[PDB]
Write a protein that binds this ligand. Structure first.
Ligand SMILES: [Ca+2]
Ligand SMILES: [Ca+2]
Ligand SMILES: [Ca+2]
Ligand SMILES: [Mg+2]
Lengths: 735, 146
């Protein structure tokens, strides 16, 4: 954000030693008010006229009211403000004076003033009473009804009490006022003419330098960030689509702060928000049942699958039930089915939400049934009175997608064990990721082991010794019997999230069951929206799989918090064969990296398995073996690049010595790329490996003596029979 | 229980270094087969693996000998990733490259005082291609290499 661009350094000092002499005059912060509104100041040679590379038709002169009082002869000017968006101040000088009659340097002041002015204390916040009352020093405050220096034509209107009764009108007039006032106080000569012919405006521009300028230099600075930021709808505005339970989230708001770690959750279905507040235990890992979104069952995991979202899918609903049955047969005593009992609230809720219509009543065998309505067209539902259970049956004129037709049965849902009681199951809180503060993990490590690592000689090992620690205690994710696959602190954190929401008012055990979906390598999933309880309460909900990814890059990754992203990201997730994209730096800078021995051998290995033809076949063609032996060489040159003993050398060296190992390889590649018939599948790979080497070398080069382009430098090599003097050449080739 | 992918490589590389193309490799050779594949065992731990099963020319290990000898250190070692995450960690800016700047930085946060000398120092001895900065590749080595 360089604010002062000096065009021509043509003239020696004098030009310079005249511009500076000008800038040291203007307040170091009137600038910051300027270099904040996005402005820049241009000091050029003799461009004077429309000759400036920025003075061309854009937003020039529409209505005249220029220089202090008036004039307008453009061709006779040196100072100008490109008035419209980002204030552009452009000025110049010719031959050596400015003082004597500073009646000239006083415009580079107002001419400037018209920068901050209109957005100064005189209008941005609005014409704040501070100035609304400073404009009244017209003829009411002190016996100084003197302003024959800013209010001649547009304010010889003494017979008009100037308050909120017309000031809105000529805002610009009170600008020529904030300007020619700025110009005097800061003018290099007439500073007291604003202290004599003005009663307060001096005391104003003064308070201004006192601090006024540092003020807006902070409300513009603050708005600087808050303005262009990343949309997020914080506050209870998001906590609303977060699905989480307010008393809970608000409860969670305490831990983040305590341990200092972001907390991100996926979306907790609304039709479960309140079931959770109710007291309905959550769906752990043991159950692979499908939620539902219609009827009494809504938000519950019906043991009947043709009563959950998948209404019709004769297979997912088929193989759907099949899942609960085992969910029970496998984990019995903990997982089972209990009849649907919609309490009081729950109803008035599935009411104005639109899931159910409570109307007509009826009698059967002796009890009362209000009946429950829902446009589902193959199922009818009804709820008891004694004990508000619920029941359904196949409408008198239809069948069950699978092939069933039953009459009124109590609706069973899945329920786990909770202190010897089968409580109905609903949506849980699946954390999307826990972001502890790097500083926190330090607390995780046990002093003994950490101290034993810093008390080391080898500085390089003092790192390996450290990172392994940072991995050991803060990145490692072991699998677990119960809580899914997760970290170690991740667990504790995970207990403190429940013991947090239970020392409040929950009676369904724990509500966060498994680990951070960033470990759901198996069946990873992508959710546009993401709720995030900042390390200090601030509720937030991204909107894009990016905004999320962007939000995390901004104030998480690049901000000292330790975060790791889903292994299965960028690769194909087996479980669901899903491709989920996520900016990976290492991959961002692959384009320019000579690949490894193994990363190469690896890639072949991969294409072998596909077109079932390797780089080299198993035969006698001394042509084939030629190729085989040949990779064995690229598989060296590359290996030879990353040689650990490369340290006993020195930077400038390292680069070179490798720029060669590199070339050496780019060669043997170009070599085979010309040989026999290597399937066009490998053709490309190699085609790709080249660009790497290339980019990779162009780099090592534009690090030291840069001008020589790879391509060229190449030509110049004798890769014929001898390789000895070759390198010797290479040397000078770069001097 | 090496995945097939964990085989194609293990062979695609077991052969590439098999001159007299039969199906067994010399001692000196096995060493080479392992380096290339990232790994790089010691001068005498290269025996205990082969030395333990001499049903061949007493000093030659076939492929079913090699593939079934990649567990002694493999089905155990699942650390590659731990390490690739401990990278993006240091890589504090998103440049895919580390730098004394960030090393020292993150070094302190984990509670450790590094001297602006012994950092423009680590970085160095970690850098192999002299580009002043450590990329994943060398980061890997420094860490794993013993
Ligand atoms: Ca052999
Ligand atoms: Ca970096
Ligand atoms: Ca490097
Ligand atoms: Mg879950």
């Amino acid at each position: 954000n360089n604010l002062v661009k000096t065009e021509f350094t043509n003239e020696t000092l004098d030009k310079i030693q005249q511009t500076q002499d000008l800038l040291k005059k203007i307040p170091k912060d009137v600038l910051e008010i300027y270099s904040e509104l996005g402005g820049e100041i241009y000091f050029t040679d003799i461009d004077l006229v429309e000759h400036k590379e920025l003075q061309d038709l854009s937003e020039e002169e529409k209505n005249s009211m220029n220089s202090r009082g008036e004039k307008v002869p453009f061709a006779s000017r040196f100072v100008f403000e490109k008035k419209r968006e980002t204030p552009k101040l452009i000025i110049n000088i010719k031959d050596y004076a400015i003082n004597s009659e500073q009646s000239k340097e006083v415009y580079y002041e107002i001419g400037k003033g018209i920068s901050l002015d209109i957005i100064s204390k005189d209008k941005s916040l609005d014409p704040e009473f501070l100035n609304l009352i400073k404009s009244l020093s017209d003829d009411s405050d002190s016996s100084d009804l003197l302003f024959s220096q800013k209010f001649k034509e547009k304010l010889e209107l003494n017979n008009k009490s100037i308050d909120i009764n017309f000031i809105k009108e000529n805002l610009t007039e009170f600008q020529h006022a904030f300007s020619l006032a700025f110009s005097y106080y800061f003018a290099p000569d007439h500073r007291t003419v604003l202290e004599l012919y003005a009663p307060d405006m001096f005391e104003y521009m003064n308070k201004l330098e006192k601090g006024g300028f540092e003020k807006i230099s902070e409300s513009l600075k603050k708005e600087g960030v808050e303005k262009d930021r990343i949309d997020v709808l914080k506050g209870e505005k998001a906590l609303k689509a977060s699905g989480l339970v307010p008393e809970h989230a608000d409860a969670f708001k305490k831990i983040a702060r305590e341990l200092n770690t972001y907390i991100l959750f996926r979306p907790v279905n609304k039709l479960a928000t309140n079931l959770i507040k109710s007291g309905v235990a959550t769906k752990g890992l043991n159950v692979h049942g499908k939620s539902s979104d219609w009827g009494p069952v809504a938000g519950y995991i019906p043991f009947d699958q043709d009563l959950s979202k998948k209404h019709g899918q004769q297979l997912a609903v088929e193989k759907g039930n099949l899942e609960n049955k085992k969910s029970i047969t496998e984990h019995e005593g903990e997982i089972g089915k209990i009849p649907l009992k919609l309490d009081h609230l729950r109803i008035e809720e599935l009411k104005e939400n639109g899931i159910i219509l409570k109307g007509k009543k009826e009698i059967d065998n002796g009890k009362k049934y209000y009946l429950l309505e829902s446009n589902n067209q193959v199922y009818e539902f009804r709820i008891s009175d004694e004990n508000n259970e619920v029941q359904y049956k196949t409408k008198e004129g239809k069948i069950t997608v699978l092939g069933e037709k039953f009459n009124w049965r109590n609706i069973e849902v899945m329920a786990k064990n909770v202190e010897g009681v089968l409580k109905p199951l609903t949506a849980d809180y699946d954390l999307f990721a826990l972001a502890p503060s790097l500083t926190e993990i330090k607390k995780q490590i046990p002093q003994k082991e950490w101290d034993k690592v810093v008390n080391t000689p080898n500085s390089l090992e003092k790192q390996k010794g450290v990172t392994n620690l940072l991995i050991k205690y803060g990145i490692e994710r072991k699998p677990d019997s119960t809580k899914g696959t997760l970290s170690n602190w991740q667990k504790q954190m995970l207990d403190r999230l429940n013991e947090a929401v239970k020392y409040t008012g929950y009676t369904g055990g724990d509500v966060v069951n498994h680990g951070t979906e960033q470990d759901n390598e198996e069946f990873p999933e992508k959710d546009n929206e993401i709720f995030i309880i900042n390390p200090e309460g601030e509720f937030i909900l991204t909107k894009n799989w990016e905004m999320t990814g962007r939000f995390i890059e901004k104030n998480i990754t690049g901000k000292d918090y330790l975060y790791y992203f889903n292994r299965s990201y960028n690769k194909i997730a087996p479980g669901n064969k899903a491709y989920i994209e996520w900016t990976d730096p290492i991959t961002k800078a692959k384009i320019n990296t000579i690949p490894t021995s193994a990363e190469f051998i690896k890639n072949l290995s991969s294409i072998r398995r596909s077109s079932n033809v390797g780089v080299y076949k198993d035969s006698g063609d001394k042509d084939e073996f030629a190729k085989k032996e040949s990779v064995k060489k690229i598989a060296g040159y590359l290996s030879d690049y990353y040689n650990s003993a490369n340290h006993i050398f020195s930077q400038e060296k390292k680069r070179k010595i490798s720029i060669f190992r590199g070339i050496q390889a780019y060669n043997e590649i170009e070599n085979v790329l010309k040989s026999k018939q290597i399937a066009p599948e490998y053709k490309n790979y190699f085609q790709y490996l080249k660009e790497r080497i290339t980019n990779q070398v162009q780099l090592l080069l534009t690090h030291q003596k840069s001008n020589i382009e790879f391509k060229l430098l190449y030509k110049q090599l004798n890769f014929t029979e001898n390789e000895t003097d070759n390198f010797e050449v290479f040397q000078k080739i770069i001097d | 229980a090496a995945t097939e992918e964990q085989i194609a490589e293990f062979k695609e590389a077991f052969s590439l270094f098999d001159k007299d193309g039969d199906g067994t490799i010399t001692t000196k050779e096995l060493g080479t087969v392992m380096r290339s594949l990232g790994q790089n065992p010691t001068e005498a731990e290269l025996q205990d693996m082969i030395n333990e099963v001499d049903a061949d020319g007493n000093g030659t290990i076939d492929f079913p000998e090699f593939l079934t000898m990649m567990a002694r250190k493999m089905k155990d070692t699942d650390s590659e990733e731990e390490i690739r995450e401990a990278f993006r960690v240091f890589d504090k800016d998103g440049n895919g490259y580390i730098s004394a700047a960030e090393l020292r930085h993150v070094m302190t946060n984990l509670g450790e005082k590094l001297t602006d000398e012994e950092v423009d120092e680590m970085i160095r001895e970690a850098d192999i291609d002299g580009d002043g900065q450590v990329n994943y590749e060398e980061f890997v080595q420094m860490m794993t290499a013993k």
